[PDB]
Enzyme design. Structure first.
Site, PDB file in Angstrom:
ATOM      1  CB  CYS A 150      32.734  12.761  16.429  1.00 15.58           C
ATOM      2  SG  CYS A 150      33.042  12.426  14.677  1.00 15.58           S
ATOM      3  CG  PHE A 201      34.957  13.065   8.694  1.00 16.09           C
ATOM      4  CD1 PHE A 201      33.719  12.969   8.061  1.00 16.09           C
ATOM      5  CD2 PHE A 201      34.994  13.391  10.048  1.00 16.09           C
ATOM      6  CE1 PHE A 201      32.536  13.196   8.767  1.00 16.09           C
ATOM      7  CE2 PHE A 201      33.819  13.618  10.763  1.00 16.09           C
ATOM      8  CZ  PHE A 201      32.587  13.521  10.119  1.00 16.09           C
ATOM      9  CG  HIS A 289      34.986  16.130  18.219  1.00 12.50           C
ATOM     10  ND1 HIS A 289      35.994  15.378  17.656  1.00 12.50           N
ATOM     11  CD2 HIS A 289      33.987  16.163  17.305  1.00 12.50           C
ATOM     12  CE1 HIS A 289      35.623  14.976  16.454  1.00 12.50           C
ATOM     13  NE2 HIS A 289      34.409  15.441  16.217  1.00 12.50           N
ATOM     14  CG  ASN A 322      35.956  15.576  12.681  1.00 11.97           C
ATOM     15  OD1 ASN A 322      36.220  14.538  13.284  1.00 11.97           O
ATOM     16  ND2 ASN A 322      34.820  16.241  12.870  1.00 11.97           N
TER      17      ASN A 322
END
Lengths: 376, 375
Positions: A150, A201, A289, A322
């Site tokens: 990430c 995710f 992020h 994500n």
């Protein structure tokens, strides 16, 4: 003349999963219905994830045909890998074509290619595959990154900045293609970590064109890459780990991650902006992020950001979940879109200076100082 | 001011295997002695490899305790990975310390770290591990490359050059740590090429320091990185492939590799040297990835090189085998050592210009133009 982002393109798998219906789907297909108490925790986890939907390559059919993938831990790397390798390339191609279109130059002008994939190891790799799929110059200079994680959105820009600035005329195509087929797996009561990943995710690919000294008669700058840095958060060893096993990619996460990251952000900001005589964190536009909602809440509180500073970041998390390294580019893309719709003076919500943050295994933090570009 | 290599350090596992005894060892530990024809084929692969010895982490003991690794195809990624991760870090650390010593500056001055490993995927990776093992600045800017393969020696230099030249004062530590525990496996009568890997691949790590604008009162340049390039050999699709499977990293090598590379190398030379007004390939010192003996023979013949032009490259292959991305650095290290011993004027066998070639999956060819430094 600073390396500049001149185009952004994104793509996602066609299967949309609404978070409100995921708990039932997830426990049903992994045959975990008998784990009533466990499903309660997962449901709350999803309800507090601040994610409304995600796009995933995985489907009920795929799981039926490959039961070992649905198992929390069962030999399944070969089958996961087959889909992973094909998926990252396909999604990457879609995003790349969209970025190339916005760029406005023929793909033959691409001199460098940076490809980043959470998983999907192959030799030759995805960079080779994309070079073939997109019919790029066979002499395109490639960089292939597997299993970074990430924080890689910052890593690729850090690399692209030096390439573009040290090579006159260089035009860099970046492709971050993230697929979770490699890490999708059933729940484990003794490993509440893995479960979190299943709720946060999502899949997605982002492509960007970076180059210095733009030809303003054809190219259109979006953001300038001012400076880049990478650091390891103090006392964060083992907080975020991922291992590639015979059962696919594993995921381990300490509960301290939000605290570890948020407590170190001001240090990253100071190191990056002090040289620029900037100290007001609210005067910057933010592209961070979104590892999870907790991280965004803690960064906001500890840094002292106004409530709407991470608006775009939260919107992307809500709309896509994500997506690892590709996420910050979805945010970058939406920020200039929203700024235009709001009639603001720059691509960065009308502000001049900004910051992009990538967080990942290490714990590693990538800090990129950005400069917006004027918008008519 | 061009990016310059200012130090080189190397390391290898302590277990040495003489090639003359490898066929018997390999077929014995993999329980394949009954496969007489397959053994003759392997024996010839080892005899024609032009490799005298290799250093490997794998031992008879490890194979005995892990039958699934000795098997051609058996679930064993987990056990291979455990050793691979520890091995790359350890060898890498040893090589890095040697490079840092030669460099002459304290390790606190390292600003960037590039780590390249054939296998051993982990998050965080070997770059993170080495940063902790070497106690480097926590803000060192890292790049981690997994599963690139044999052309990567060129790749890391291509990266280091741009980093060093675009960042004033930047000092880049490169670590290419290659271990074959990930791909070591028994032979297969149906996949005859798979065993080519157990005949040619050796273990080893190389570390180098790269930086522009050397402080000549402390740093000592070895080679300058003039230009870099990467290309895909035409019509070479599928010639070299590797897949990370439940049984570890597989190896596929087609018989067309030697000719594909040798028949296209003049194109890489022309693209790199025409801009420098150089056309005599013998006027250059050569550092080529020794993928195998046939590649060196064919390149020499087709390029028109003097018989001894690749002497150092062949010597490294003889003494260590094919160590993937680390190999060209062992060659670079030995070339400057021999140049000194032979009383030559430059680190490049007395010559001014040189070329470094990396060959690997693609087929990919990395071409780095080098310039020697006076001895």
């Amino acid at each position: 003349k600073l390396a500049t982002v001149m185009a952004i393109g994104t793509a996602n798998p066609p299967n949309c999963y609404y978070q409100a219906d995921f708990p039932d789907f997830y426990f049903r297909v992994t045959n975990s219905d008998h784990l009533i108490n466990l499903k309660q925790k997962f449901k709350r986890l999803c309800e507090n994830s601040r994610i409304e939907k995600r796009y995933l390559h995985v489907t009920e059919e795929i799981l039926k045909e490959n039961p070992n993938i649905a198992a929390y831990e069962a030999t399944s790397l070969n089958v996961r890998h087959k889909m992973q390798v094909k998926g990252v390339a396909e999604l990457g191609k879609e995003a790349a074509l969209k970025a190339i279109k916005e760029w406005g130059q023929p793909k033959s002008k691409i001199t460098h290619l940076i490809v980043c994939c959470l998983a999907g190891v192959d030799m030759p790799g995805a960079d080779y595959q994309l070079t073939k799929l997109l019919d790029l110059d066979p002499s395109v200079k490639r960089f292939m990154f597997y299993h970074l994680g990430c924080y890689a959105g910052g890593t690729v820009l850090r690399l692209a900045k030096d390439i573009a600035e040290n090579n006159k005329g260089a035009r860099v195509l970046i492709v971050c293609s993230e697929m979770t087929t490699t890490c999708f797996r059933g729940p484990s009561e003794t490993h509440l970590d893995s479960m979190i990943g299943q709720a946060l995710f999502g899949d997605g690919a982002a492509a960007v064109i970076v180059g210095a000294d733009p030809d303003l008669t054809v190219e259109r700058p979006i953001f300038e890459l001012v400076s880049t840095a990478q650091t390891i958060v103090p006392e964060s060893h083992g907080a975020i780990e991922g291992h590639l096993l015979e059962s696919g990619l594993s995921f381990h996460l300490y509960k301290t991650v939000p605290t570890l990251i948020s407590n170190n952000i001001k240090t990253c900001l100071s190191d990056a902006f002090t040289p620029l005589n900037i100290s007001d964190w609210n005067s910057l536009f933010w592209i961070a992020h979104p590892g999870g909602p907790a991280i965004l809440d803690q960064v906001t509180a500890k840094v002292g950001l106004e409530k709407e500073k991470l608006k775009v970041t939260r919107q992307v998390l809500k709309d896509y979940g994500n997506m690892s390294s590709a996420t910050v580019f979805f945010i970058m893309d939406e920020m200039r879109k929203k700024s235009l719709e709001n009639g603001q003076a720059t691509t960065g919500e009308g502000l001049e200076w900004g910051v992009l943050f990538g967080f990942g295994p290490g714990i590693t933090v990538e800090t990129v100082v950005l400069r917006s570009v004027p918008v008519i």
